[PDB]
Design a protein around this ligand. Structure first.
Ligand SMILES: Nc1ncnc2c1ncn2[C@@H]1O[C@H](CO)[C@@H](O)[C@H]1O
Ligand SMILES: Nc1ncnc2c1ncn2[C@@H]1O[C@H](CO)[C@@H](O)[C@H]1O
Ligand SMILES: [Zn+2]
Ligand SMILES: [Zn+2]
Lengths: 515, 266
């Protein structure tokens, strides 16, 4: 329950089993459903597209992100005016997803009332919009619901800022520190105005409080020691905003943080939500744009629309192909069959739909695509005409290429997206259940012993146990570290992932003595 | 035992098949009141014919996604209704009589019902059913409205349903083939693959029919249940005990008689 267990490739060039103590709070925060969902998403992504060379780097990054998430959750967990502010922000953070679902319900309730609007020239000749319902309570209900929806949108923004922004800032700072130390981006290379992220990150380097969310507070000293001899100690000190003379015994940071926040896509979406809610008080019918939130709210809707978005580039490109083909048909029509495009019953006033090239193209794109049999359903009958056979071929080819083939292509793209997503899911699951995540040894070897693979994955090579050991190392003092702990802590500090057992394990090393 | 009878009857009335048969009888009784109530017994073909049950399994495999995308269609049509009721109300006059106009979008709920009714069922969308926008100030806006309605609702939102049905067909086929492949490539009891047993000709067939037959295991289980505990022999009493404490460690897993005595047998 609390006894941890991992295996590492120790300094003795042999697999060594390490025992550590896990805490109940960390176990609960790891068993939390949101952390479980994040774990599932990470596993799916890495198994699907993450390569084997960078797999464990991605795993360690995910472990660090999870550790920071559980730290934030522990901070916000609830056991003068500053106490009120801290308590209120913690309440919004713990109930952020409840408020987001609450806002969705208020969007449906408002839009249901909006179905009772009526328009009339006379007041209840600029027209008048009013609610037509006999009960007499739905207008005050709509007013109260609109005010409540705006309030809930504001609370959702505040809760997001309190809850999810710290993780984004932490990830940005971690990536920047890694680039400074192990890459020398600004020290040696520097971006070329193509990396707007790097250009914006230039600001925070000189700030005294560059590492705030990231744990490593010694990053500036480490990069200074690593790059001083090569790039000038004085130059490095100037770039990093620190003075050497102080060691003989933040508006800029706020600007950079707010730039990252306003670049964040989820924050931009919530800001758009709030803006549209505010426009709702100007025109209640602007609350209909909050029904689009169902796609981002419902996981079922998100998965269903993933079929459309999987091949969206091909869908728009084949729409362009359809436009080109219809333009070619328009060229042929405007050059040869102009007489058949008279859409006027009145004989005195003809309405020629193909006497202008753009008019004919618009007519085609409008009616021919939406017609069941093509443009021949909408244009004049060619019976008993000189160009009867040519026009028949024209209509038949239009129907076959545009109505049949060019829409079967779209439907097949959607169906292929469905099938490909299903196959990706099944492939990820099969690989996960047939091969060990850490060492990569197949279940065939471990299955010689009954329940051998299950025991090995739950106990010997548990990725949860590896994350727990990582955070145990991070929490524990460097001086208090024991031998193996300091060894693996060092290889974590230089980002060397050779301590993870790959291709072998305790059983594969000591099978002769164990059995 | 009145309490036992009450509990038994509660379980019976909770049983789904018993509830279905009770509904069948109730509708048959209502048939004598109105013979046309006997039409509800034609729905029994789905539960009777295995072919029909398998065919309707394609619809029911993704039924949650089908109803959820129907709700998505409703939301999208509601958005189109909002846009129509706000901007293109003049095009929704469905009256040939000039003296009496029949405005289908002068009321919001009427316009939504009109959309849900005719626009979805129309071949080209709502533009097939509403007034022609030629020679109008909002001609291009209304053309974009109709084209987007046709593409999103008629094309994409029905291709989604058809693709869901087809994917259900394919997934059921793949599940069947996967189950069959696993069953014929691995032993049910011990889990050892057929590659080991196939060294001997017909080795896997002999092993599955004779050594590790699940039918034989069931027969032994019922033989133990029938036989007296006193009459049980040594191994029989041993396995009977581990059955009594629900311990399934007596089933051979990962090894068998051949894997144990291959050196002496061959
Ligand atoms: N190294 C691993 N650690 C944890 N689970 C693993 C590992 N390798 C495979 N799995 C699979 O992941 C699931 C539990 O996380 C199980 O299906 C298990 O077989
Ligand atoms: N342990 C088993 N007992 C019976 N049939 C098995 C077993 N393992 C696999 N099978 C397969 O089941 C079918 C017969 O029940 C055959 O295809 C056979 O190969
Ligand atoms: Zn392993
Ligand atoms: Zn067997």
């Amino acid at each position: 329950p609390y006894l941890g267990r991992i295996e590492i490739m120790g300094a003795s060039r042999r697999i060594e089993r390490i025992y550590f103590e896990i805490s109940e709070t960390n176990r609960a925060q790891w068993e939390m459903p949101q952390v479980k969902e994040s774990k599932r998403q990470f596993i799916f992504d890495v198994v699907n597209e993450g390569g084997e060379a960078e797999k464990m780097e991605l795993f360690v990054s995910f472990c660090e992100d999870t550790i920071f998430e559980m730290q934030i959750a522990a901070q916000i967990s609830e056991p003068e005016l500053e106490v009120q502010r801290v308590k209120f922000l913690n309440y919004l953070s713990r109930n952020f997803y409840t408020l987001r679902f609450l806002a969705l319900f208020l969007a449906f309730a408002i839009n249901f009332i909006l179905l009772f609007y009526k328009v009339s020239d006379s007041p209840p000749n600029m027209v008048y919009y009013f609610l037509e319902e006999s009960t007499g309570y739905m207008e005050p209900a709509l007013w109260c619901l609109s005010l409540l929806h705006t309030l809930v949108a504001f609370l959702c923004i505040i809760g997001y800022n309190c809850l999810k922004v710290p993780l984004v800032i932490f990830k940005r700072e971690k990536e920047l520190a890694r680039k400074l130390e192990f890459d020398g981006l600004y020290i040696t290379e520097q971006p070329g105005d193509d990396d707007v992220k790097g250009q914006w990150d230039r600001l925070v380097l000189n700030t005294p409080s560059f590492p705030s969310n990231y744990w490593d507070k010694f990053v500036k000293r480490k990069v200074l020691d690593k790059h001083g001899d090569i790039f000038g100690r004085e130059r490095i000190a100037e770039l990093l905003g620190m003075d050497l003379a102080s060691l003989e015994i933040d508006v800029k940071y706020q600007i950079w943080k707010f730039g990252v926040i306003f670049t964040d896509n989820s924050f931009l979406y919530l800001g758009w939500y709030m803006v549209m809610s505010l426009l709702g008080h100007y025109n209640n019918f602007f609350f209909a744009a909050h029904l689009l939130d169902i796609a981002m709210g419902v996981k079922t809707l998100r998965t269903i629309l993933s079929s459309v978005t999987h091949n969206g580039k091909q869908l728009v490109m084949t729409v362009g192909l359809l436009a080109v083909v219809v333009y070619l048909y328009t060229v042929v029509a405007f050059n040869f069959f102009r007489k058949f495009y008279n859409k006027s019953e009145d004989e005195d006033e003809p309405d020629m739909k193909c006497d202008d090239m753009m008019t004919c193209y618009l007519f085609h794109m409008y009616v021919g695509v939406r017609a069941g049999g093509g443009i021949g359903d909408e244009i004049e009958d060619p019976a008993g005409d000189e160009y009867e056979l040519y026009r028949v071929v024209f209509d038949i080819t239009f129907f076959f290429f545009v109505i049949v083939i060019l829409l079967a292509i779209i439907q097949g793209l959607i169906i292929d997206a469905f099938g490909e997503l299903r196959d990706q899911q099944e492939q990820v699951k099969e690989d996960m259940e047939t091969k060990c995540f850490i060492c990569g040894i197949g279940s065939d070897y471990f299955d010689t012993t009954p329940h051998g693979f299950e025991t090995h994955t739950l106990e010997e090579h548990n990725l949860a146990n590896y994350m727990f050991f990582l955070m145990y190392l991070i929490n524990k003092d460097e001086t208090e570290h024991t031998g193996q702990e300091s060894y693996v802590w060092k290889m974590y500090q230089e980002r060397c992932w050779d301590f993870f057992p790959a291709g072998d394990c305790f059983r594969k090393q000591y099978e002769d003595q164990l059995s």
